[PDB]
A paper describes a structure:
At present, the best structurally characterized pLGIC is the [name] [name] ([name]), of prokaryotic origin. Each subunit consists of an extracellular domain (ECD), predominantly in a β-sandwich fold, and a transmembrane domain (TMD) composed of four helices, labeled M1–M4. However, the [name] is a pH-gated channel, activated by lowering the pH, with a maximal activation at pH 4 and a pH50 around 5. We instead found that proton activation is a complex multiple loci mechanism, with the key contribution stemming from the coupling interface between the extracellular and transmembrane domain, with E35 acting as a key proton-sensing residue.
Author numbering:
A (entry chain C), B (entry chain D), C (entry chain E), D (entry chain B), E (entry chain A): 5 to 315
């Protein structure tokens, strides 16, 4: 089969739509999600036109093999989509109405700067390559763009599914390509991070500060080093659920800054002991009393400044 | 092939029946499960009718290619089901009796609020898309719905496998769709959680309370901080077998609350030492004696209130 | 093609055989194993009979497409088996001799009660569905049942591969089904559990009992709490190699019981200190002396009783 | 079909070009990467020549089945590439212009010596096997060699995508082979290694050196042994993201050397205590004072020498 | 198609050759490796013979479909190999020269007794099943056995790739089978085990022996118990990279024996304290002084004896 011939010198407009059935597996480390959806295509093929009076039928159904169908592909996919044709219908004027159900693993990068309080715009790019006989341009039929009410992405809130209606038309290996941008806007459910990571991490830090109400070097060393090791365990746990970013994340900044607090608590604990041994308990006392106020105050201001830079 | 033509203006009724052969791999984190079952379909095609006297045969067998078969799909699947046709039989009146054996990865959300004492209703949605010539409606043939007595879901108790007999008929991309709800009711085997997570977690907590019968600051600091770290290990272990929920789970609530007990034990241990050093052992004694009763009592009431809110 | 017609009213007997070449991937968590074997089928089709004098040939080879072949399936498989036909041979009388080499992931439940000293009977169920024209019954040809001398299941001892020669004949969706039970009997190689889990676990427990020869509360608290944490690490390690059972396992019982020993060692360590502080070292001395004998004795009797209940 | 016949004694030149659409999943442990690209092939087949007046078209399209296409393979792939033909265009001279979109898992060794500050040259080898009738030679059409502006390897900086234009022509099993080298030059984003591994590791080491300002053997033993265990956790974490190299890596060398510092800190802590007990606090004092300067100085020079050997 | 008919009563000799292109993913726990090679087959079929004078051609190319090809299989594979035919060439006498490029996951057991200083012989078994008309025997064409110089197995040294030229001819289900043994000889790159596991493990052990230069029970208990827990972490790490063997490995032996050293250090530490408390510091002194020499000496002799038994 050959593509539909033009009346003048106009390109062929293939009207597209995506309707999400199942959205799943957002892998933060891999920066990938899986999709199960309807892909609907529509174009005019004058060669397929018929008279509904003479033919009796108001619509004709065709097997993909019988008629010309445009080679439509996804750009940002891992492998070629698993697709199964559902229906092909032709109207009297020759307007073809194609529908397939597909499944694909989409590769769209994420912005972890505000993590776990981040929002994302997942991208799905549709593309068509022009043939030598005719140039093919993509279009968005908004009535056939959308999603199921049951569509759920675990640990995420699905905000919207829309399309950037104007295609990106460009040359690639001396042939025209028509790209379309479908956008899935989602926002992370930060809830569980609070009782599982944030609050346990602050509790261990506050436990280290009880060393400011103790003269016992041996006990202090145990308090600050034990809690420091539990902080290393949280840092390791957190970095396992994220990829290696060339920038700092919100949780990353807080986790890093808390090391400085532990490091300075060790210097305080050391200085206090050294002085007690040097028979200077009075000077050691002043530094400990100051630390009781200084540590929570510097922690609160530091966190305010960090939240300000990130939000 | 074309669909069966109607006598009047009635829709085509495709009678369905899923019979579970194998139920396996319920991944709590992914909220998916895998199924292996028989799918049976039955409809009338007057075009296939024959006289049993003239043809001799009482039933005719057909290859899927030879006759019209409705395009039946699962809604909440990851990818299209792996299916293999077992038999196609036609009765004199033209009643077709289709049977296939399939396997699919079903995606159905889980409610972790009462975990590990939760029960679920796993959903399996069957669907058919109406053609322009005729509208197709699904039906449940209850004589052909069921499961093998050997069907076993590891770590779960299979309660029932039933179907919501009235289909959800609705429009989707200007065509009628007929959805059916098959339900697999299961309940978690909470047994192993008791000797592996719940009881070890309570033992370490009770070990921390032995600090209320000790005047040794150094030993107390070791007791409470060590057990706190083992509690962090259990929290990390528990959260690895579950997804990130925008709500609190039963085990989650208990695990979180226990941090508050450890935090308050550290303040008690600190206060007791401070007083002993300030030459106030009498006041420190009263607080320690009170803690011996207060801690187990507040723990028991808190747990009663939590069980009440969750069950 | 149609099935072979009967002489009288007798069912068609399909003679079966399985010869294992490769057995691998016994996942204890998934309760699955993978197999690569020969499936041999044999039946009489009188329509295929020939005279060896007239035809010259003593045997005729057919492509699967050319002749009728029974639809044979495995019951307890995850997905349909990957099969490749090796040979199809027809004798003068019409006896067909089919042979294929297949690979499948078998789902057969395991009994972890005596773990890691358990033995299993892995099940492989072969099934055939009767057609409307004729009823098909399965049979075991013992000369074609067996296993390769190289067959090795990692961490397991392969005892036998046999077949329960009498099929389970039953009705399923108003048609006859003939099921056959092939059994692979295996026994776990418990060896490595001794130097890697059992002996390290007993060593840490015996190290905790050295607290019965110490008056140092601070050292005792370190001994019992440190070793308790190493016991938690072994419990976590052990439960990762097993699924969640609704019953107690041998290792499970021992691991759990050992927590009680640690809990009671903490009470002893606490009581001893309390008394020393109360200026009652004599009473504390009696309890410590008793613990030295009591702890290993109660541990030995408890373990004898447990081994008795489980073996 | 047979290959194109020569005019004289010249080999057939198949012009190639790879245009990267997606580059993802660079696994350091496996030394693999995944690619999604355009493969374009072009050759002359005079047997396909046509007159456009006669044909009614200026460019002919063929299905792969219809015409002779050279068997082009990748060398360093795990399995055969997943390819889908996009277009085949024949011009009146007989110039075939083939285009396919493929995806493959490329196996290429990585040099971890300077890790995590390493740069790589990923290799992609194209090959063609000569037939008995004609010898096939590969060529690079530079106008068809490029990469999409969005191509992003997570945790890596993509520097260039080029081709070594001169093929490696050689004998293999008495037939000519024409190999082409496509190179992807990338450089690791070392950023995250600094706040997640390097700085936490140095902080714990500096915490161990606070033992040089303490006379408390019990506290010192806790300081040096605790931090040593946290260093073991970092070493285990680091070696999990890398394969086993028969050479030393930069991070590997630093991680190893730091063990020597911990080992010598333990000897210092031991010597200091032994002397204090032997009533020689003066000698112990000199060694401790020297250690305060010696340890950071020897650490700084050692690191300078290491950076010098590796960069 | 039928197999080539015999002149006498001689079997058909199929000449084989494997040429490795890619050898990768040796997974110790699964005892598997993945291979990507060339499989070349050659046999005489007198029916395909031609006169080069009359036919003009010196060689004829055939599609697999057109001529008889022997069903060649691998024995020790997980699934059937992914193969793609490269070329089929026929010489005047009727000598067929087949060539395919395949990929397979080979299952060959490994001997971990000397681990990580082990060497292996990975075995690849080629097999052919004789038909009723003729018996098929395999042969090795040494000129077509070999490997690419770039072939690299990560963490392993490839020594040789050879074939056991005499096939194992045997009966299996009353038909002859001709097995061939292709051997890939490899030796582990033990290098990284030295700075990552062996040396860190010895350092922690030597740190435990500093307890022999301390009278401080509290410090000793910390030294020996802390280092014991780090030894448990190395044992857990090591056993994760290996399968469960019914025999002892070299690393396994050393790791196990080191537990005995820790156990005896705890008894020494306990005895020393008990004596000091019983006002017997002189007796405690003798035992401690002896332990300083005894422990490293018994460790050195034990290790010599172990290396001797294993190498
Ligand atoms: C008055 C003391 C101030 C201490 C300042 C320490 C600066 C550390 C900078 C690290 C930079 C990265 C190197 C780490 C050594 C720890 C310092 C111990 C201080 C002991 C104080 C004794 C009381 C007089
Ligand atoms: C250590 C201390 C950690 C403190 C955490 C601060 C969280 C924060 O700052 O959260 C920030 C997010 C903001 O969400 P946003 O939509 O991105 O605001 C975008 C605003 N613009 C458009 C103006 C830039 O607030 C929340 O979700 C509120 C819940 C926070 C709960 C924290 C409990 C502890
Ligand atoms: C009588 C003292 C009461 C102390 C209550 C402390 C409340 C802390 C609330 C944290 C909120 C999140 C910041 C943590 C510091 C720990 C408190 C140490 C108390 C020492 C007591 C001294 C004896 C008089
Ligand atoms: C820390 C302390 C943890 C205590 C755990 C309480 C468990 C609980 O409360 O379990 C709750 C479940 C209830 O099952 P249900 O069907 O959902 O009841 C639904 C009831 N309605 C319909 C009225 C709402 O009881 C069990 O399974 C009983 C076994 C519990 C064993 C716990 C041993 C410790
Ligand atoms: C005479 C001492 C008897 C102690 C019995 C302890 C019973 C604990 C039962 C736990 C049930 C689950 C709740 C845990 C508290 C630990 C007990 C501390 C005992 C201190 C003894 C003081 C010396 C007179
Ligand atoms: C903590 C202490 C743990 C003690 C472990 C006891 C093991 C046991 O009791 O092992 C039990 C198994 C028995 O094997 P069976 O075939 O199932 O006997 C079935 C018997 N019937 C048919 C009569 C019921 O004995 C072994 O394999 C012997 C090796 C044990 C080595 C343990 C070294 C430590
Ligand atoms: C003056 C003391 C020098 C000690 C040097 C020790 C070097 C150890 C080399 C290990 C080689 C691998 C074997 C480890 C024992 C630790 C040494 C304890 C030293 C105690 C000092 C007593 C004060 C005089
Ligand atoms: C423990 C102390 C660890 C110190 C780390 C040193 C890093 C280093 O030395 O980094 C080396 C790389 C060099 O990059 P290159 O392109 O390979 O230079 C090749 C040079 N030739 C061609 C001359 C050989 O510098 C960087 O990326 C700079 C950032 C370093 C940040 C470290 C912060 C701490
Ligand atoms: C002189 C005493 C020798 C000690 C020998 C210990 C043998 C342990 C054998 C375990 C077999 C498995 C059961 C472990 C108890 C630890 C022993 C504590 C010894 C205290 C010594 C007191 C000083 C007289
Ligand atoms: C705790 C102490 C652990 C000591 C480790 C001993 C290693 C060993 O003994 O290694 C053994 C291997 C031998 O290699 P082979 O080819 O199998 O010799 C076969 C010999 N026959 C044929 C005679 C039987 O030597 C090596 O690779 C040398 C490098 C060892 C480095 C260890 C550094 C520490
Ligand atoms: Cl696609
Ligand atoms: Cl489906
Ligand atoms: Cl099957
Ligand atoms: Cl390829
Ligand atoms: Cl094979
Ligand atoms: Cl034999
Ligand atoms: Cl034979
Ligand atoms: Na088409
Ligand atoms: Na059909
Ligand atoms: Na301590
Ligand atoms: Na057949
Ligand atoms: Na071709
Ligand atoms: Na053939």
């Amino acid at each position: 089969v050959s593509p539909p011939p033009p009346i003048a010198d106009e390109p062929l407009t293939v009207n597209t739509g995506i309707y999400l059935i199942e959205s799943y597996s957002l892998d933060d480390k891999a920066e990938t999600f899986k999709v199960n959806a309807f892909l609907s295509l529509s174009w005019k093929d004058r060669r397929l036109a018929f008279d509904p009076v003479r033919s009796g039928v108001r619509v004709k159904t065709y097997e993909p093999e019988a008629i010309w169908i445009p080679e439509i592909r996804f750009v940002n996919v891992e492998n070629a989509r698993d697709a199964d044709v559902v229906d092909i219908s032709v109207s009297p004027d020759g307007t073809v109405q194609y529908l397939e159900r597909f499944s694909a693993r989409v590769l769209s990068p994420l912005d972890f700067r505000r993590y776990p309080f981040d929002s994302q715009t997942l991208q799905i790019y549709l593309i068509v390559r022009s043939v030598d006989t005719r140039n093919i341009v993509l279009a968005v039929d908004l009535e056939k763009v959308g999603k199921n009410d049951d569509v759920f992405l675990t640990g995420w809130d699905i905000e919207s599914f829309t399309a950037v209606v104007k295609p990106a038309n460009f040359a690639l290996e001396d042939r025209l390509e028509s790209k379309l941008d479908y956008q899935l806007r989602i926002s992370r459910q930060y809830f569980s991070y609070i009782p599982n990571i944030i609050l346990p991490m602050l509790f261990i830090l506050f436990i280290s500060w009880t060393a400011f109400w103790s003269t016992s070097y041996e006990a202090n060393v145990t308090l600050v080093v034990s809690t420091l090791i539990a902080h290393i365990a949280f840092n390791i746990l957190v970095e396992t659920n994220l990829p290696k970013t060339p920038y700092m994340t919100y949780t990353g900044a807080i986790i890093f800054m808390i090391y400085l607090f532990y490091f300075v608590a060790v210097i305080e604990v050391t200085v206090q002991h050294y002085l007690k041994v040097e028979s200077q308990p009075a000077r050691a006392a002043s530094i400990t009393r100051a630390s009781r106020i200084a540590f929570p105050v510097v922690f609160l201001l530091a966190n305010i400044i960090l939240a300000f830079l990130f939000f």
